[PDB]
Design a protein around this ligand. Sequence first.
Ligand SMILES: Nc1ncnc2c1ncn2[C@@H]1O[C@H](COP(=O)(O)OP(=O)(O)O)[C@@H](O)[C@H]1O
Ligand code: ALF
Ligand SMILES: [Mg+2]
Lengths: 98, 93, 109, 439, 74, 73, 80
Amino acid sequence: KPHRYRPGTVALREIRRYQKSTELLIRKLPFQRLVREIAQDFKTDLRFQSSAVMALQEACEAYLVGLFEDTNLCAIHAKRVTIMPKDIQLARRIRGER
Amino acid sequence: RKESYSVYVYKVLKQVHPDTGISSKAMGIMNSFVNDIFERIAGEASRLAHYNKRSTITSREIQTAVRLLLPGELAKHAVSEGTKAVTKYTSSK
Amino acid sequence: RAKAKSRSSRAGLQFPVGRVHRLLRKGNYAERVGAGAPVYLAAVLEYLTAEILELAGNAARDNKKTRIIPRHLQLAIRNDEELNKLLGRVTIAQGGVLPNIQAVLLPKK
Amino acid sequence: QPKLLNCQLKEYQLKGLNWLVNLYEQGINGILADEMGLGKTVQSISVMAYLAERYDIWGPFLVVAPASTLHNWQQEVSKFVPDFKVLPYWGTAADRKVLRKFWDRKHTTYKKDSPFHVMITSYQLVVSDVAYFQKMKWQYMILDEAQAIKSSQSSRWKCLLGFHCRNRLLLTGTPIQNNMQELWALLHFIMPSLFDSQLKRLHMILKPFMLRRVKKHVQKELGDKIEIDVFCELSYRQRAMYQSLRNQISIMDTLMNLVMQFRKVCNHPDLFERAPSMARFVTDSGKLAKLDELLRELKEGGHRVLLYFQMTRMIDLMEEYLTYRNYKYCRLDGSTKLEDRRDTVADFQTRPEIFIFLLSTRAGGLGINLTTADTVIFYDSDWNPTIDSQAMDRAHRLGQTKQVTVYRLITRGTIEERIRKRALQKEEVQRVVITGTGS
Amino acid sequence: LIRKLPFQRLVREIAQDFKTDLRFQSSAVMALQEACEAYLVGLFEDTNLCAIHAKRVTIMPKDIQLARRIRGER
Amino acid sequence: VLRDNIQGITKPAIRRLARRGGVKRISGLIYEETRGVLKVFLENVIRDAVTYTEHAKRKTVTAMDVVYALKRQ
Amino acid sequence: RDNIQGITKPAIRRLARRGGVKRISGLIYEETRGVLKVFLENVIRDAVTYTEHAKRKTVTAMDVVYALKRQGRTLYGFGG
DNA sequence: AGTAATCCCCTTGGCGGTTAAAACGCGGGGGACAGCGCGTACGTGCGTTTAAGCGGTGCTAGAGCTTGCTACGACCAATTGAGCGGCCTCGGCACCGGGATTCTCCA
DNA sequence: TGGAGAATCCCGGTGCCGAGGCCGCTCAATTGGTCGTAGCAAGCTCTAGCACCGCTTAAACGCACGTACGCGCTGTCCCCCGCGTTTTAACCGCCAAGGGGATTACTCCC
Ligand SMILES: Nc1ncnc2c1ncn2[C@@H]1O[C@H](COP(=O)(O)OP(=O)(O)O)[C@@H](O)[C@H]1O
Ligand code: ALF
Ligand SMILES: [Mg+2]
């Protein structure tokens, strides 16, 4: 029989890994292509500096990491340990994005 | 020819922590921090002059700006540092 | 033609009272810039730079590092209540986050 | 002569070395203005090898060339002194940064151990890296085809003027070019203490500062440039366009536009707007018809041909025509990278299966050998006559294997007439302003 | 909604910390009151969503604290 | 000196403000929590409004000083 | 094209770990992709507006930083 | 003074591989969620009393505006040295490996 | 309580690349004098902010009391986690291209 950590144990071990670190968590090349797509939707035959798509990635990831915190507090404010779409929808409505 | 605060940041760093270095990316955030707070103060000083109908950005404008933009204890310590720097610029030339 | 000594040296500052005078003019914040206004501002810019780097040098020392890193700036800025209030809408490149796990998430007995 | 050369100088080149040495030892500058193909790139090496063997100067020597010539220098310098140490300062910025590591400032005269004696670079690099070319001092400078300097308003004149160089030598094909102030820029460059800012007196004051031998007196085995100004004729499509475009002159009062727009359709109407078949494409240009006929006659003759174009888009259209027929070819224009220039010139010179070389007038005209061609066709002509002369003498050159012939595809009745007439005038004027060996 | 006189006295009481014997223009009080009522109304909205999200209908102090925490007021 | 005037925003007033926010039912602990919210807000408005007042060396706080304090929120 | 699907499930997981989240409904992932692109659809259009109004045919790092700063998300490190 | 060629540089695109990250399958566990019972805590209504609101009176602090001038900043030309771009190097930090200590889970 | 084993830490070694200091120079900060004006100063006007009184009645408070709703408990089931397998595309490097921006040449027009 294999040894097995319980459900939720490695979620905590992962939290302690992605907190306490600074690496970018979205893969570089996929984010570039999404940015180029959204750029095409606004102005064709644009170009981007490397530091422009880096600057744009850093702002996005910080926005999503900071958003999840507010949804975790919504989840934890209900009885739940699990975040659900209605927590994002409440968080963004309290923030005033929604 | 670009211009940077890096040499002035180093000469503050080597005062507060003469042993301690700074990485270029950290120095970049120091440039961004100085630029952002310089412009935030000057922006309020502009508005304080504008509100008063005055053509001059005095040290009085920057004092009232500093007491608006900074938290209560950073405000008082900064106002202290600023008021003595001017008081030693005055009584020189 | 006397031997020039910088307006910073006379004010007693590292930060450049000259650039702060020019930049207060180039930005056209107002028509006229007082003589002491660049001095007062250059002193506050120098002071706040020391506040950041004092706490960040401590945090660098805690990490057993000789050299300050964007991580240490974030830790300093968020640990100090007033820097955190001064920068509560600023994202720092490669700052990361504070280690913070909500109490309910830690395992039961 | 310096035994370091591992080569003989020719008779005329040895007197040329003596002149160049005399100017150096007397502390004065001059122009080596020998006719194209007589060997100025060799006399330039001989004086460095003398400064090595006679005085152990061993550099630093700066050698500034047009970009397509830079491999001609790199190779021939290595030939005419096997022991010289050559720095090839060209490439991307990162490559030049790696090359610049060898610019020792600390010795103003280089030891024979120094990592170079001679440095070859582009007329664009000396202006692009000027801040690095300043903060340096040169024992000698060659400007390898100095008619590039002839505009005193050019930055490459303003910059190279002040490089802190103890002596300077210009090589040129014919220095007189458009006029006399455009000569003074070359004279001021070498001797700004003397010249600062009647046509009988010049011959007696340029003589100390110029040497100007000519290929009737030198290399007599290079039989004359047989030439056929063809005076071919428009075709129906071109003349419909030409008349519709010449009508614009009647409406006018814009030749600054139209002379190009006229010469575009003089070359091929598909440059203006494209037609679907080779029968139309060959025959709807009077030039391309007469060219295709002549190329057939030449290929049956076993000739190998250089075609010069003024418009690079015509090198594309000609390259369609060539690929739609049986002809193996090379291309060399100002869009090519320098290694492509090196190899295509070497490829053409390697093997006689290649029929035709397409060359742009300027990028392909200036200064590297094509001595296994035998026929030169100006499909279009340079409106400065001197540049067509350099192009002709890339074939008509020392080592030229066979009797050269030259063709020029003048379209009768077009704006092409004005251009070759005025080139004919200007080459006459240029022989008013010079005739005589110099020294 | 708030009674005018006890808001004036609240304003006076608060202001006395910063400068003794300030004066307040009558319009300046209303500009503070109309901002405070609008701020409290707009916060109770955000708390009511927190209650409704936690399946309560009765708003509770942890709803105010969650509203402010997400608005960044704390 | 004045004191305890934060009890001048009564509990019915907090009801009206909550009902205007759509609240159906109100915990009895809200009423003191609302005062800890209003006080921390109204302090940091008036701090700026007075800082704008005294800069012009005046003594009445004007509606313009309030507007500039709110504009700093 | 749908490079929004290139914001994969593990990446959204990693971001939620840094956000301190223990357990994630599988419905969160498609919600998070919708939220991310609505962010990018505002920052890039302002960053492009800067490049267009300043008459350049490339987008620089500082165009983004002005675009962020103008929407209240000041970024230090990329100029700024 | 114009327009076209030439040449630099820097961004985009493609090709190959290699391996690290994403996707997929599957058991089970424990957390989401509906259901239940109670009890206490909030909404309602009434009688009480408290002071907010209004109309009216009185005073003076000080907001707001004009006059007069000189102290202070704008403007220019000559001087110079503080600050930037380029080049070099060695030491700090990362990355690895291997044994030591810690923590988690089923017994 | 123990134990096994995975996961996290530590200690020393390796090496590489970026931090810290040096060098040349330019151009931006400083010195010196001029000149205009604005805002600091003294002075008048009267607005409106503060204070007090007295009345009215609508708003606030204390209390009774019913029942609507918050909260801990119980049961279930479904669905997201932990771990092995399969596979795909992100990363790296190297070559091409093209494009654009600066410069240079030559002619026509003024
Ligand atoms: N003395 C010589 N011995 C052998 N070859 C020579 C000599 N002089 C010139 N050549 C050849 O003449 C050819 C063209 O000479 P070059 O100097 O390049 O002409 P240009 O005057 O246009 O530079 C070169 O290939 C060179 O090898
Ligand atoms: F001197 Al030449 F082509 F004539 F290089
Ligand atoms: Mg030559």
